[PDB]
């Protein structure tokens, strides 16, 4: 099961990834998580990635493609993987097509979670994230059981630094620009599937899981 999740910032990629992982346990490969970890530990690639992230810009394609190519070469990706947030440019999609050729592999689906851009700033500025397990919640749209507390592991919820209004405006503009050409690229391959991201979280997943049924 070789999958890509795509979607504009705040459409609900991470939320659906956790469900897909919870049910199928395929590795979750998130370029955002990889960069964020690189930052936590002060590698030079991490420190250079931070300046783009802080501004809501994309990290350059060469860097991103390099780390994905190395990550997909591991034994845990031999039977399946869930790419989350990569590709997000056509150039990344071309790279991925060729990385996969090198490995003797092919994508099964690119799952695009669609939500109108005009709803998305609200989704990110109100997001709260578990410090321990990374599960996400939203103060209005999807709150936790107890204010301040993750329902999964009990950890404390924080605001991600790039979920600032100004950074969010730039992330939506940057990703909007990249999205239509990427959609066209995969629509031509035949394995792009669009999911209505406006529905409730379980129903979105239901729609995704209809596709994943043939493992
Ligand atoms: N490939 C690449 N190339 C170059 N640079 C790269 C890169 N990948 C990453 N980067 C760099 O790293 C940065 C961060 O990238 P990354 O971490 O990938 O962020 P992103 O793509 O902006 O996605 P987000 O995590 O913001 O949103 P999400 O859709 O996953 O939302 P969630 O499920 O939490 O949901 C959002 C909110 O909505 C809520 N919610 C979700 N679903 C629903 C629903 N159905 N109903 C109600 N509320 C919902 C949630 O509770 C939550 O509060 C980039 O800006 C860039 O700088
Ligand atoms: Mg995410
Ligand atoms: Zn948690």
DSSP for 95-162, written as a single string? HHHHHHHHHT----EEEEEE--GGGHHHHHHTEEEETTT--EEETTTB--SBTTB-TTT--BEE--GG
Between CA 76 and CA 31 the distance in angstroms is 17
Is 127 in the active site? yes
Could you tell me the maximum CA-CA distance found in the chain, to the nearest angstrom? Answer: 48
Please provide the size of the chain in residues: 215
Between CA 29 and CA 81 the distance in angstroms is 7
- Residue 115: HSE in the Cβ half-sphere, 13 Å Cα cutoff: 23
Which residues does residue 3 pair with via DSSP β-bridges, in sequence order?
A: 82, 109
- Cα dihedral sign, 84-88-91-97: positive
The answer to whether 120 and 9 have CB atoms below 8 angstroms apart is yes
Between CA 197 and CA 199 the distance in angstroms is 6
- Indicate which technique resolved this structure: X-ray
Q: Domain residue spans in the chain? A: 1-215
Residue recorded with tokens 């991470």: 14
Nearest CA to ligand 1 atom 2: 86
Which of 109, 105, 153 is closest to 131 using CA atoms? Answer: 153
Is 160 in the active site? yes
* The ligand 1 atom nearest the CA atom of 128: 53
Does 103 sit in the ligand 1 pocket, CB within 6 Å?
A: no
Between CA 150 and CA 158 the distance in angstroms is 10
Does 7 sit in the ligand 1 pocket, CB within 6 Å?
A: yes
- Residue 102: HSE in the Cβ half-sphere, 13 Å Cα cutoff: 10
3-state secondary structure of 26: coil
* The ligand 1 atom nearest the CA atom of 126: 53
Hey, what CATH topology would domain 1-215 get? Answer: Rossmann fold (3.40.50)
Is 88 in the active site? yes
Does 36 sit in the ligand 1 pocket, CB within 6 Å?
A: no
| Burial readout 67-95 (b: 16 or more C-beta within 10 A, e: otherwise) | bbbebbeeeebeebbbbbbbbbbbbbbeb
Between CA 99 and CA 45 the distance in angstroms is 21
Nearest CA to ligand 1 atom 15: 32
Determine the Cα angle at 93 with ends 89 and 98, to 5°. Answer: 150
Q: Best substitution site from 142, 198, 199, 206 to test ligand 1's pocket, by max atoms within 8 Å of Cβ?
A: 142
What is the resolution of the experimental data for this entry, in Å? 1.9
């Amino acid at each position: 099961m070789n999958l890509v999740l795509m979607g504009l910032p705040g459409a609900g990629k991470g939320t659906q990834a956790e469900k897909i992982v919870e049910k199928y346990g395929i590795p979750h490969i998130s370029t955002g998580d990889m960069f964020r970890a690189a930052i936590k530990e002060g590698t030079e690639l991490g420190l250079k990635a931070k300046s783009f992230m802080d501004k809501g810009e994309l990290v350059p394609d060469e860097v991103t493609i390099g780390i994905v190519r190395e990550r997909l070469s591991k034994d845990d990706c031999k039977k399946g993987f869930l790419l989350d947030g990569f590709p997000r440019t056509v150039a990344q999609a071309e790279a991925l097509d060729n990385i996969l050729k090198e490995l003797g592999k092919k994508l099964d689906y690119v799952i695009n979670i669609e939500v109108p851009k005009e709803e998305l700033m609200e989704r990110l500025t109100g997001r709260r994230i578990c410090k321990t397990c990374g599960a996400t919640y939203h103060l209005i749209f999807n709150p936790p059981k107890v204010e301040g507390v993750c329902d999964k592991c009990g950890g404390e919820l924080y605001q991600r630094a790039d979920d600032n209004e100004e950074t969010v405006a730039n992330r939506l503009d940057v990703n909007m620009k990249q999205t239509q050409p990427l959609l066209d690229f995969y629509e031509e391959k035949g394995y792009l599937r669009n999911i209505d991201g406006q529905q409730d979280i379980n129903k979105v997943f239901a729609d995704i899981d209809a596709l994943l049924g043939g493992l």
